[model samples]
Target: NTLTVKMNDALSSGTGENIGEITVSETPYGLLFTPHLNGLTPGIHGFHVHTNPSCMPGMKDGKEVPALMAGGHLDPEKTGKHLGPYNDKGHLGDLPGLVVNADGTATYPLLAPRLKSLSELKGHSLMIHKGGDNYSDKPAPLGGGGARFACGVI
Candidate 1:
């Protein structure tokens, strides 16, 4: 079975809009992700699977936010740290960062070898942060991803 998700730009000011599609293909090792679409700043972005399917925005501490309702990263094992997908001891939601090509295009595909199938991503939401992630707590919490740029329910 093929699993794909249509992603949308999650803006904190106005209604969110569609931006791209995340295609998931299963491999003998794990899962492969290919993003097809555009309208994003070219750079590294923190990518992860949130615990909820809702990308609904809400006010937190009287400040408007985006994708706040998507909940935290999927930490089934209660591992509340940021570790790369290769680090099995960390949260399963800690996926590899997405690389956006210049001119708002994504070329390199992402590989989630830690994932066995697309079934684990069901019902969860894909959240792309506004900044890069180091998969470490030393820099910042959640890899210093301050804002939610895009989201898609898987």
Candidate 2:
């Protein structure tokens, strides 16, 4: 079966912001993710599945923050590290990098070979970071996706 998750700009939910549409299809090997993100900057960003289901803005440090309520990347193994999606020992939420074109549109496919079912994703949230991700933890964390810009309930 296939599951479609719709995401919107976290900062502007109904204000005509960026939109991220993800399609997760089940296969014998793993799950295939086809994401089409639009209205984003013409560059790369970090895209992953978060642990929290609430993407609502909440109070933090006596200020309003976006997507802060959503937990970290899905690391069921407690890896506590940033590794690419293909690493079986890394964060399960790590995914392929998101690339946006000069026209502010992105279309790509990311496969999480370790995941087997859509049920594992039902209670989580999808997030888009502010910067590009290198799928590594060397100079930064979580591919340096800065802050949350877009999100969706998966």
Candidate 3:
């Protein structure tokens, strides 16, 4: 079955601004994510599946943080790593990056070869980071995706 999830900006409270949506479907190799979004900065963005179903803000440090309730990437095996989609030993949520065009639209489709079931994605959040993902933990944590830009509850 294919699931369509609405995307919105990250806000300290309430639903962030509406962006668009993405559709997730199971493929023979894994999962395919097709985006129908706009109003985003052009270039690459970090895309991953978070552990929670809520896109609401959660308390962090001293104040509410945007999409903090979404928690971290999905790591069912407790690998505690972010090695991109190709690495089976990495976080299960590591998906192929998202690319917004110069017109601020994201119409591309990405594939996560390690994820094979649509049912496993239920009750999770699909998160988009502000910066590009290096697909590794390298010099920064979580591919240095920076602050959360957009999200959607799955």
Candidate 4:
């Protein structure tokens, strides 16, 4: 397993000082990703695997923003819109949000579909949203989570 990412501020309001590492490994169910984040606030943050390789930040009136340019999570099956990680009919990129501790560190494991390949992950972006995704469109679109906080392309 290998890792690839591009760090940028296009995703969220954070200082863009955070550093993250992602590791891909084999699991009984499928491929597993171990991601480590440093220099982040302690809380639950939205996380997803974007569809494009462009880690460039999105410009709202010409400002670099994380996740914005990364676009939505990868959903080749078109799954159900932005459902949570546990949702069976949601975007494949959807995974349980990451929770950073007061020490400014967080780690989580993500099990991807059996058909996914490491080679295919190359060129796509991984994003950390500023908010949480409930996997439901109750009061907001895409779980009401807003803005891209930190982003990188693999």
On TM-score, the candidate that comes out on top is 3
Per residue, candidate 2 scores C-alpha lDDT tens digits across 46-86 of 98889998787666779666787778898889998888788
lDDT of 3 at 135: 90
Better of 3 and 4 by TM-score: 3
Candidate 1 residue spans exceeding 4 A from truth = none
lDDT of 3 by residue, 34-141 (tens): 999999999999999999998888888897778989999999999999999899888999998998999999999998988889998998999999988999999889
Cα-based TM-score, every candidate: 0.95, 0.87, 0.96, 0.78
Q: What is the C-alpha RMSD of each candidate to the true structure, in Å?
A: 1.2, 2.3, 1.1, 3.3
Candidate 1 weakest lDDT stretch, 10 residues: 11-20
| Candidate 4, 118-140: lDDT as tens digits | 77576677777678767776777
Residue 143 error for model 2, in Å?
Answer: 1.6
List the pairs of residues colliding in candidate 3: none
Clashes of 3: 0
Question: Which regions of candidate 4 fall more than 4 Å away from where they truly are?
Answer: 4-8, 11-18, 60-67, 112-116
RMSD, candidate 2, Å: 2.3
Colliding pairs, model 2: none
